[PDB]
Structures are given as structure tokens and as C-alpha cells.
Assembly symmetry: C3
Homo-oligomer: 173 residues x 3
């Protein structure tokens, strides 16, 4: 596997976590219960700590990094889509980060936000809870409905389930 200890800092991974063999986890990284990191994703905890909250998933090729003074915190029940890039930011509980979305240092995404695929959130930007954030540079286009939020959570919960399926039914050929 690609789980690495850097210096004296070794990842803290809950047993229930699914970490794909090609998912790189380095240094100061905390992966909470029911979280999952997929193929090709990389979580490099060499500067500030990086936390992936319980029930949260980090999909294929997503890259999580930080810079000094910019810890990366992903709250519980969050989906980080394929190829996304989170850099030293804060993601609120229940949010969904779209495919290839880019979020830079100091950015703060509130609870239940949906960041659109291909969006780019610049450094220091803050967004209120339940916001649909689209564009590059991204901005709040409107508030999400109960349905939007419920579908986002359904996807995230589905991944928390898929996690167990991959842990017990995935066999190399």
C-alpha cells in the first residue's frame, strides 16, 4: 500500500476506513470512521494537518494538500469528487465538492454547500451554508433546496456504504 510515515508523523486511520491500494496517505493525516479514499487520490500531510471527517469520501485522483498556517479540514459527511483539489481549506459538514473543483488556501465552504464541477474557489473566499457555488472564480448562485441537499447526502451516504463493499468484495486479478 501507499500509506507513509513522514519524519515522526504517521497517518491516523480508523479501521473502518477504505483506503485504495493506490491512494497515497502521508504524514499528518487523520481519516475518521467510515471515511474512504479512492484510487489515485493523494493526501499529503507534510505541512499542516489534514483531517477527513467521518463518513466522508475522497474520490479518484483528488489531491489534498496544505501550506503552513493553512490546515485542511473536511467535516463529516462530505463528498470530495473525482479529481478535485483541496488546498489548505475548510469544508463544512454535508457538503459536496464537484468533479475537478479547485479550492485554495483559507477558503471556507459552509455546511451543506454544493461546489460545481470545474469550479475554482480562490484563496480566502467564504461561502454561507446551503449555497450552490459555481464558476471560476466561483460564487454563490443561489441557495440549495431541501431536495438538492438531500440528494447530495444520499450520494455521500452511498459512498460510506460502497466503502464496506470494496473492503470485503474487491479482489485483485
Amino acid at each position: 500500500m501507499t500509506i507513509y510515515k513522514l519524519g515522526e508523523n504517521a497517518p491516523s486511520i480508523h479501521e473502518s476506513v477504505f483506503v485504495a491500494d493506490s491512494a497515497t496517505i502521508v504524514g499528518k493525516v487523520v481519516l475518521e470512521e467510515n471515511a474512504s479514499v479512492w484510487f489515485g487520490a493523494t493526501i499529503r500531510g507534510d505541512n499542516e494537518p489534514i483531517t477527513v471527517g467521518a463518513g466522508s469520501n475522497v474520490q479518484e485522483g483528488a489531491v489534498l494538500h496544505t501550506d503552513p498556517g493553512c490546515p485542511l479540514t473536511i467535516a463529516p459527511n462530505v463528498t470530495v469528487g473525482h479529481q478535485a483539489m483541496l488546498h489548505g481549506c475548510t469544508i463544512g459538514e454535508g457538503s459536496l465538492i464537484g468533479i475537478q473543483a479547485v479550492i485554495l488556501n483559507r477558503a471556507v465552504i459552509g455546511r451543506n454547500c454544493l461546489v460545481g464541477a470545474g469550479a475554482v474557489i480562490t484563496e480566502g473566499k467564504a461561502f454561507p451554508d446551503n449555497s450552490l457555488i459555481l464558476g471560476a472564480p466561483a460564487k454563490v448562485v443561489r441557495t440549495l433546496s431541501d431536495e438538492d441537499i438531500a440528494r447530495m447526502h444520499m450520494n455521500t451516504k452511498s459512498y460510506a456504504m460502497r466503502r464496506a463493499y470494496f473492503k470485503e468484495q474487491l479482489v485483485r486479478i
Copy 2:
């Protein structure tokens, strides 16, 4: 290698296929004759089936996935560029998907289309044959010329050839 069987579903790969050691193939995936999947690419067939048509290539870091009710079908002679992301869509024969392009569920790209680098095709969008599709959200900017189409195909055919070269002349150091 990173070829995985998920549950009872194992990938169907034609012997002529080139699958890079770091290319992840999981579950319900069909890779037809002369297709090729490069380093870091991931094809996750855990929901709907994913088919890569004969003579088609999936370049470095591209990620192919689907959601229930949204199978991913890549027709023959198609090029999927580096870092692209295809999610539950349909790609017509002879097309070219640009670098980092993103195509979401239910999108349908006709035959001989060229999707520009960095474009974003939203869910459900459909585009006619021979279209040059650019933007995010992407749209048809104009019809491609015989030359445009011929150059696209030349690239794809070149990859079908490069496939054999890598299968027999690539040696780990």
C-alpha cells in the same frame, strides 16, 4: 497490476489491450480490441457497465465512472485525453475528448466530435455529429472540417499503434 474483480464482476479485457500497471480497472468494465488505458487512469465499473470501444484510448489520469441508470459507453476509435473525466455519458465513434475535459451523466456526444481541453459538459446535454464543443458549460461553436476530423482520427490511430509499442518495448527499470 491494478485489475480488480468487484463482487462477481470481473473486467473483460481483449488480449491486444494495453493496460498500464498503474491503470485501475474495476468490475463491470469491457475493454475492446486495440483499446489502451494509460498510467494513473481509473475505470470504476461498480454501478453501471463501462465499455471502451475498439481502438479507443484512455490517457493518463483520466477517470471513467457512472451512476445507476447512467452507463458509460465509449464508441470505437475514440481518444479520451489526459486527465479527462467521463461520468455516465455516451461518446460517439471517431470523437476526441480534450485534456481535462469533464462530461457528466446523460450527456451524449455524437460521432466525430471534438471536445475542447478544459471544457465542461453538463448533465443531459446532447451534441450533433462533427461538432467542435468548447466552454464550461460547453456548447457547439461550429462544425468540424474534414481536416479537423482526419487529424483527430490520426491521433487516435497513432495511440492504437503506440499501444503495441508499449506492450512489447516498455521495460521497468
Copy 3:
């Protein structure tokens, strides 16, 4: 590791280089002193040669490729950010390529340029030294200040240092 010889062409890597185990280096590739290639990055030297200048870094998931007649040359002291894609272009000394930025064939980036995250530089575009290049298609928005340039270099130099730390303190778990 993922260092590959293609045909008769084998990578030329300076001993001081840090090459992550999952970093793919193939064929005609030259990695100069103090350069570093991170997890999931791929440098495919199967067409034209690809050179990574001394003290330059190629971050997670970045993909470097070329096409015939389009060599890829990355000058010394350059930072290529996470998930960037450089295709047959020329990057001037002291520059910084932002996260997920895409630069296509024949593009020329002068010395000390900063390409913004998510930008897309089309084929053949040329940009003068000390330019802040943003957008897709990207363009020069303004000249960088001494500070901007100095901070860019600080990041790149920091990576040249981090390189040694990973070479001696990174241990698989």
C-alpha cells in the same frame, strides 16, 4: 518503482532527484539535480524529449507529455502545480504553473511567469517574462511585482528542500 525504459530510451535522473514510487517516468526524460516528481505524476517521453530543469518540481497528478516536433522543456527553478498538464510546451526559468493549469503544444511561457490555477493556455501562445497569466483561454492580466516573483521562488525553493526531507524521512507503513 515506476521508472520505465521505452525501446532504447531510458530516463536520465540525477541522484539528488526525488521520484515518488507512484511517479511514472518513461523514455526520453531528463530530470536535473534537485528536481522532484510527486505521487501520481506522469512524465511520458515517448515522442519528443522532456526535460525538467534543476530545482524544479512536478506535483501530484501532473502529467507531462509531448507530440512530434513539440519537445517539453521546463527550465530550472520552476514549480508545476498539482494536477497541471504540460503538453509539448516551454516553461521559462523561475515560473510557477498553477494547480490544474493546462498548457498545450508550442505555448511559450517566459521567465518568472505565474500561470493561475485552472487556466488554459492554447497552442502556440507566447507570454513575456514576469507575467500573471489567468483565464481559459488564458491571457496576461498584468506584470508581477518583485514580491509576487519572490514568493513564487520561495515556494519552488521550499520544494527543492522538501525533496531531501522525503528522500530521507519518508518510510512506508
